[PDB]
Write a protein that binds this ligand. Structure first.
Ligand SMILES: *[C@@H]1O[C@H](CO)[C@@H](O)[C@H](O)[C@H]1NC(C)=O
Ligand SMILES: *[C@@H]1O[C@H](CO)[C@@H](O)[C@H](O)[C@H]1NC(C)=O
Ligand SMILES: [Cl-]
Length: 333
């Protein structure tokens, strides 16, 4: 029941207490864990991934009711051996995502250090999945702006809570791409692109999202909801921003747009956004001198968007094109 190598990992059936020792995952290998229902998996060392040509994920764990106890250990992706400023858009191959977590349970207190590109992919789930006290430290990717597409958490899943986490990166802190009942609470995001829903693609539906109690600093955006201009059979419905403290924003405090990859222009109509609120505790957002406070670019949006608890200051005014939705502010114009 102690995993000391990629080959030991296949031999954990029957264990309710698995110890994951530190080792290197060699080039051309992946680390896959399929623990018994309800097993506790405890990390006892750091796992380093040698430079590899494989596609990600390089680590996959899938189980039901897993209790993952990180004990502050590290999954080291050696990202600086890949980073070239182009991420997964072009350039060198980037194994991505680095980690994949599927099923259900509670994952606590480990660090992903220097992912090649996107760090932690979440989903699908079979019951509630909680990620608590995880650090994605891709800060080294800031040097010469070489880190790219270093998303902290990419979520396509139902019934997820991500709380008490820290992300230092160059792209979305979280990107919620599909699923219902997703909570992102009491996290700290810096360096990247803020807290995102999307990009929403054809056939994807995000609903019942709570973004509460987070701090965002030194980022390109505060919060974003992005849908591909071309997406159809898609939606975002029921989003609540509550008690977020955001500052140091370079481009947009809030950008809600159906023009992606463009910020504005000819917004799409096939990925309707509805019921987007800033309520509960104040969400305060301070933007830089050249930044825009709030832009909403809707081709198809609906509902009574209560933005009473939003305050955005700094920078310049954006534009509001909310389609059928009625936005009741708040201070940001
Ligand atoms: C990748 O970069 C090359 C230029 O070096 C360009 O010709 C190609 O079309 C680019 N592709 C993407 C997908 O960005
Ligand atoms: C998981 O989400 C699915 C769809 O949201 C819902 O039907 C189900 O009740 C949720 N399960 C749990 C355990 O929350
Ligand atoms: Cl290889």
């Amino acid at each position: 029941c102690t995993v000391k190598s990629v080959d030991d990992a296949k031999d954990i059936a029957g264990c309710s207490a698995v110890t994951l020792n530190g080792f290197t995952v060699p080039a051309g290998n992946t680390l896959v864990l399929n623990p018994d229902k309800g097993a506790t998996v405890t990390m006892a060392g750091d796992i380093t991934f040698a430079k590899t040509t494989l596609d990600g994920p390089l680590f996959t764990i899938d189980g039901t009711g897993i209790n993952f106890v990180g004990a502050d250990h590290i999954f080291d992706g050696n990202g600086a051996l890949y980073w070239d400023g182009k991420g997964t858009n072009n350039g060198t191959h980037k194994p991505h995502p680095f980690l994949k977590i599927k099923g259900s349970g509670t994952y606590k207190k480990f660090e992903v250090l220097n992912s090649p590109a996107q760090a932690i992919s979440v989903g699908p789930t079979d019951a509630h999945l909680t990620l608590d006290g995880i650090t994605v430290d891709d800060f080294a990717g800031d040097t010469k702006n070489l880190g790219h597409n270093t998303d902290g958490f990419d979520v396509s899943a139902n019934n997820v809570t991500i709380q008490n986490c820290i992300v230092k990166n160059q792209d979305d802190c979280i990107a919620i791409n599909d699923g219902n009942n997703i909570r992102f609470e009491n996290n700290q995001c810096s360096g990247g692109h803020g807290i995102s829903i999307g990009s929403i693609a054809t056939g994807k539906h995000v609903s019942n999202v709570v973004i509460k109690g987070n701090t965002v600093t030194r980022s390109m955006y505060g919060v974003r909801i992005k849908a591909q201009r071309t997406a159809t059979s898609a939606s975002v419905s029921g989003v609540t921003y509550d008690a977020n403290t955001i500052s140091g924003i370079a481009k947009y405090g809030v950008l809600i747009s159906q023009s992606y990859p463009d910020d504005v222009g000819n917004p799409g109509t096939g990925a309707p956004f509805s019921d987007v609120n800033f309520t509960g505790g104040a969400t305060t957002i301070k933007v830089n001198n050249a930044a825009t406070r709030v832009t909403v670019e809707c081709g198809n949006c609906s509902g009574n968007w209560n933005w009473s608890q939003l305050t955005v200051t700094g920078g310049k005014a954006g534009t509001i094109k909310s389609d059928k939705a009625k936005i009741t502010g708040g201070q940001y114009l």
